[PDB]
């Protein structure tokens, strides 16, 4: 399952 | 900026004439990802060929696989034509037989 938390650079 | 595709054309099984087989074109190490791949029989695009979903390996270089069922016969020339940016390369399948 993909990582649900992403942050823009 | 740009890294031209390595192109490798081969068949699943030995290219025995008259035997059901799969023609495969493995296109790797290219960038940018925008690209066109077609399998040709006697210079004409083979229909119903399938292409893997865009992916890449460690090192970031993209790779794609295009394949279609085929039945090689004495008369016919099979090839993989790849257009990437300003270059179009056509590679003829070698049966080694």
């Amino acid at each position: 399952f993909a990582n649900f938390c992403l942050m823009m650079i | 900026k740009v890294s031209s595709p390595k192109i490798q054309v081969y068949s699943h099984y030995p290219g025995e004439y008259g035997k059901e087989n799969t023609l495969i074109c493995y296109v790797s190490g290219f960038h940018p990802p925008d690209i066109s791949i077609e399998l040709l029989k006697n210079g004409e695009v083979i229909a119903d060929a399938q292409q893997t979903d865009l992916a890449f390996e460690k090192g970031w270089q993209f790779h794609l696989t295009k394949s279609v069922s085929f039945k090689p016969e004495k008369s016919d020339e099979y090839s993989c034509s790849v257009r990437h940016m300003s270059k179009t390369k056509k590679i003829v399948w070698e049966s080694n037989m």
Binding site: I9 | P33, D34, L54, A55, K58, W60
Partner: protein
């Protein structure tokens, strides 16, 4: 055996060949998931995921990746500006994943790249981000303040592994399969070089060796690259170019999973003879 779960995201500025965002999920380097920003839907790519997960799983996966698309869109706009390259066609990539060993021990990685070159990389031992260039340093400071490394490490060491274990169970038969190579000796002409061709095997590890009379022989040998078949199996070949082969008995030995297959000159096939 060792197993892995990996995700690779591709972000693109300017079309048309591909959508703005593409995601592929893999177990042991075999695709089981797909998503892109055209369909806005995450979909199964193997039988074992189809039979073991359903609507709820995919709705959640879709929802996560729609967010990924949104973030990638904003991210690539930013990095392009930092390279003063905002006009042209460019790329933003992310790959991450975990490995589970027989050991029970685990490995994990988290990396990003712009235009096919390293941008930032996770060091989950020091909980820092390695910036490949000046353009990445601002991101490094931002992410280290937001504790992105801690979150990523948490995912890699826990969530990623827990799902990998599930997936391995789902597709145990396919993932643990051992398929022996089909081996043939090829020759265009009685005077031409001879190719030992192995195909249809899995896992991908294979050894092709030539023998003359023979204990093995590695002069005039050209070992080709490991190549993928269309069905998840692999193939590889080796070519022998030796002088008139006639007075000496050559053979090809292919070893896969501790088992060997031998082919001698009596086995050589050709078109059209």
């Amino acid at each position: 055996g060792t197993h892995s779960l990996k995700y690779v995201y591709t972000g693109v500025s300017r079309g048309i060949d591909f959508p703005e965002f593409t995601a592929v999920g893999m177990v042991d380097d075999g695709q089981f998931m797909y998503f892109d920003s055209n369909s806005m839907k995450a979909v199964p790519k193997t039988e074992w995921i189809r039979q073991n997960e359903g609507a709820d799983y995919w709705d959640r996966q879709t929802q996560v990746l729609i967010g990924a698309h949104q973030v990638f869109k904003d991210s690539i706009q930013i990095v392009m500006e930092r390279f003063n390259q905002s006009k042209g066609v460019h790329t933003w990539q992310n790959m991450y994943g975990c490995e589970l060993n027989d050991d029970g021990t685990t490995q994990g990685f988290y990396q990003y790249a712009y235009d096919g070159e390293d941008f930032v990389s996770l060091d989950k031992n020091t909980l820092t981000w390695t910036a490949a260039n000046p353009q990445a340093v601002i991101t490094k400071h931002k992410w280290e303040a937001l504790a992105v490394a801690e979150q990523n490490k948490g995912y890699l060491e826990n969530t990623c592994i827990e799902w990998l274990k599930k997936y391995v169970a789902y597709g145990k038969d396919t993932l643990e399969r051992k398929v022996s190579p089909q081996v043939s000796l090829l020759q265009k002409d009685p005077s031409s070089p001879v190719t030992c061709h192995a195909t249809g095997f899995y896992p991908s590890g294979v050894t092709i060796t030539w023998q003359k009379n023979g204990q093995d022989h590695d002069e005039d040998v050209d070992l080709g690259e490991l190549l993928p078949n269309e069905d998840g199996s692999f193939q590889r070949m080796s070519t022998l170019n030796v002088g008139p082969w006639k007075n000496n008995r050559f053979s090809c030995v292919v070893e896969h999973q501790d088992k060997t297959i031998r082919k001698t000159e009596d086995d050589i096939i050709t078109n059209f003879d």
